């Protein structure tokens, strides 16, 4: 009888541990397909990361070029506005002298 | 008994595959929840960004409007600045002739 | 010797209960299943959406930060030149009261 | 009897069968363990990545907007330089032009 009884308990305890091993295998085979999901994911936003701050160094390059070209040319601006209102200024000056002759011509 | 045996091991695997089943309910219902809350949160912030993109257009658009505008404008008044400076160097050269006149006499 | 049969009887009843028990979480853990497949599918389509109307959002803005500083260029100039029309207007009325002057007295 | 070591002999097996589910059932809690970890490690890292791409892909839109930008005004920069050029050009030559008529009609005054 006793034998009986702990062959009972064994096949108990047996089939909750073998319906537990279901449960484990299930479990693990879950986790390593996300876990193939996720490091996919990861190495793709590795990926983007990448190529996004490339351009970034890129873009700075180019505008910080830009940058100072736009200066280099509001300088050129501003001293070829210059020597345009000095020659403006000769020409002024000529053309009065130019018209003060032809008065004296005409009163002569 | 033999079959208390074997029904013993069924029941222990019943119990077993019961308690697999009830932690995976309560991990999934979990789960839901959480994409639930994320997707409700993503729907907030789409409808807030198409609402800025509309706004935005707009903005755009009168932008733009005025830009245009004051382009028109600044051609104008370089056109009156051109005609303007030529009557003063016409007047100039009046003056200067009345000038050498004077002179003369 | 009795005590098989309400050992036995005690072990079949106890299984039916946990296997109505049993296949009826199965049942709630296929229909969880579906619904997930389902939020993750939405959840993504919602982040594609979202990503798209993200970048738009800031080029719009990008762009209008431009136009703004485009605008305030503008006005400025636009009241440089009017400064500079006003003094050229006031420049050409000078010269016609001098020019009125040098004829009226050279007249005299 | 003969019955009892037919239930010893079943007894040991059933034992024995246990002792190895247990030893399966202790991997394979230590494997699900890490295996958790790898996938909480992971899914951290990409919520991350997500937030610095989100931060690097604005970064360009903000630089390429101002690399755009600053092109029209090099453009329209140019532009006025060109202008600006010739039109030195032409005063100078105007300038030069005056002299000249200023020579000939002192000249002719002297006469």
Sequence with gaps: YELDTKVSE???????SEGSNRSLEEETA???SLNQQLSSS???????????KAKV??????????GDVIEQQ????????????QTE???????????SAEGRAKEA
């Design 10 to 16: 064994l096949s108990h305890k047996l089939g909750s």
């Design 89 to 99: 200024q000769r020409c002024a000056d000529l053309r009065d002298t130019l018209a």
């Design 57 to 66: 160094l890129a873009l700075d390059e180019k505008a910080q070029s830009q």
């Design 42 to 52: 990861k190495h793709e936003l590795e990926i983007q990361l990448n190529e996004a």
């Design 30 to 32: 879950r986790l390593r």
């Design 74 to 85: 509001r300088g050129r601006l501003r001293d070829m506005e210059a020597a345009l209102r």
